[PDB]
Amino acid sequence: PLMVKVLDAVRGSPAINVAVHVFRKGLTAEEEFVEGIYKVEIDTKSYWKALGISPFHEHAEVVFTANDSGPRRYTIAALLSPYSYSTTAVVT
Amino acid sequence: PLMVKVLDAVRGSPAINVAVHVFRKGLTAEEEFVEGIYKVEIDTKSYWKALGISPFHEHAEVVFTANDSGPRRYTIAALLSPYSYSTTAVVT
Amino acid sequence: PLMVKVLDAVRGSPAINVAVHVFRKGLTAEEEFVEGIYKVEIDTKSYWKALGISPFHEHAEVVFTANDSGPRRYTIAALLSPYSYSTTAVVT
Amino acid sequence: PLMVKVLDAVRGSPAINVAVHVFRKGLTAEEEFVEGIYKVEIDTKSYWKALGISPFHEHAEVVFTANDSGPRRYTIAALLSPYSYSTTAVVT
Amino acid sequence: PLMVKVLDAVRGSPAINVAVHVFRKGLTAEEEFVEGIYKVEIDTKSYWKALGISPFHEHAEVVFTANDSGPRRYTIAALLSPYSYSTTAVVT
């Protein structure tokens, strides 16, 4: 007998993030996984990935240049952070 | 007997994010997975992915230039953060 | 006997996001998955993907230029964050 | 016997988002999946995808230029965030 | 015996979004899927997709230019966020 109890009795206004998982039992291959339940990606860059089988096989001339240079601003308050009876403010 | 209880009794106005999962039992291949239940992607860039089988096989001349340079502004409050009896404000 | 209970008894005005999943048992191939139950994509860019079998096979001359440079502004409050008895405001 | 109960008894005006799933048992191929139950896509750009079998096979001259540079403004309050007994305002 | 109960007893004016799914058992091919139950697409752009079998096979000269640069403004309140006993306002 497998028995799981999470947050059986709750009272008084909480702020919660819950994730419960119960289990009982070519270039890239993956099998029966769980990925990115709570994931935050910001300013993620990928350039070349899995081009293919035998690319640029013979006599290839490649010039690769990656320029990542710009005025960018990211302002975040309370990222993945639950709060209660509090105050959050962003002033510019 | 498999028995799961989540948040059996609740009272008093909570703010919740719930995710419950129960289980019982070529270039890219994937099998019977679970992905991105709570996912936030911001400013995500991908340039070249899985072009194909045998690209640019012979005598290929490629000039690759990636410029990512611009005035961009992102302002976020309470990202994936539930709140209760609180105050959230963004002032510019 | 498989038995799942989520939020059996609730009272007092909560704000909830619920996701319950129960289970019992060429370039890209995928099988019997679950994807993007709660997904937020903002400013997502993809340029070249899965062009095909044998592209640019012989004597290909390619000039690739990617310019991503512009005045853009994103303002968001309470992204994927349920709230109760609170205050949310965006002032510009 | 498979038995699932979600939100058995509810009282007092909640604000909820519910998603319940129960299960019992060439370039791109997909099989018996579930995708994008709650998905929000904003400013999503795709340029080249699945052009076909053997494109630009011989003696192809391609000039590719992507300019994404313009004054754009996105203002959102309470994205995928249910609220109750609260206040939401966007003032410009 | 498969038995599913969602929101058995409800009282007191809630605001809900419900999605219940129960199951028991060439370039692109798809099979017996479920897609986009609650999907919001804003400012989505696609340029070239599935052109066909063997396009631009021989001696093709292509100039591709994509300009996305204009004054555009999007203002949204309560996107996919049910509310109750609250106040929502957009003032410009």
Curated annotation (Swiss-Prot), chains A, B, C, D, E:
Q: Which BP terms does GO give this entry?
A: negative regulation of glomerular filtration; phototransduction, visible light; purine nucleobase metabolic process; retinoid metabolic process
What mutagenesis or variant effect is reported for residue 46 to Y? In AMYLD1; amyloid polyneuropathy
Per the UniProt entry, the effect of residue 8 to G is: In AMYLD1; leptomeningeal amyloidosis; leads to unfolding and exposure of N-67 to glycosylation by STT3B and subsequent degradation by the ERAD pathway
Query: Sugar-bearing residues?
Result: 67
What this protein is reported to do is described as: Thyroid hormone-binding protein. Probably transports thyroxine from the bloodstream to the brain.
Q: Which disease is it linked to?
A: Amyloidosis, hereditary systemic 1: A form of hereditary systemic amyloidosis, a disorder characterized by amyloid deposition in multiple tissues resulting in a wide clinical spectrum. AMYLD1 is an autosomal dominant form due to transthyretin amyloid deposition. Protein fibrils can form in different tissues leading to amyloid polyneuropathies, amyloidotic cardiomyopathy, carpal tunnel syndrome, systemic senile amyloidosis. The disease includes leptomeningeal amyloidosis that is characterized by primary involvement of the central nervous system.
**Where in the body, by tissue, does this protein show up?**
Detected in serum and cerebrospinal fluid (at protein level). Highly expressed in choroid plexus epithelial cells. Detected in retina pigment epithelium and liver.
Q: Which family does the UniProt entry place this protein in? A: Belongs to the transthyretin family.
**Protein name (database record):** Transthyretin
Write out the annotated subcellular location: Secreted; Cytoplasm
Q: Which GO terms describe its molecular function?
A: hormone activity; hormone binding; identical protein binding; molecular sequestering activity; protein-containing complex binding
- Cite the effect that the entry attributes to residue 66 to G: In AMYLD1; amyloid polyneuropathy
The UniProt-reported impact of residue 38 to H is:
In AMYLD1; leptomeningeal amyloidosis; vitreous amyloid in some patients
Recorded consequence of changing residue 83 to C:
In AMYLD1; amyloid polyneuropathy
Q: What is its main location?
A: secreted
Q: Assembly state and interactors?
A: Homotetramer. Dimer of dimers. In the homotetramer, subunits assemble around a central channel that can accommodate two ligand molecules. Interacts with RBP4.
Gene giving rise to this polypeptide: TTR
The consequence of residue 23 to V is: In AMYLD1; amyloid polyneuropathy
One cellular component GO annotation, for this chain's record?
Answer: extracellular space
Other known facts = Tetramer dissociation and partial unfolding leads to the formation of aggregates and amyloid fibrils. Small molecules that occupy at least one of the thyroid hormone binding sites stabilize the tetramer, and thereby stabilize the native state and protect against misfolding and the formation of amyloid fibrils.
Could you tell me which cysteines form disulfide bridges? none
Q: Specify the effect of residue 76 to V.
A: In AMYLD1; amyloid polyneuropathy
Could you say which residues bind L-thyroxine here? 5, 86
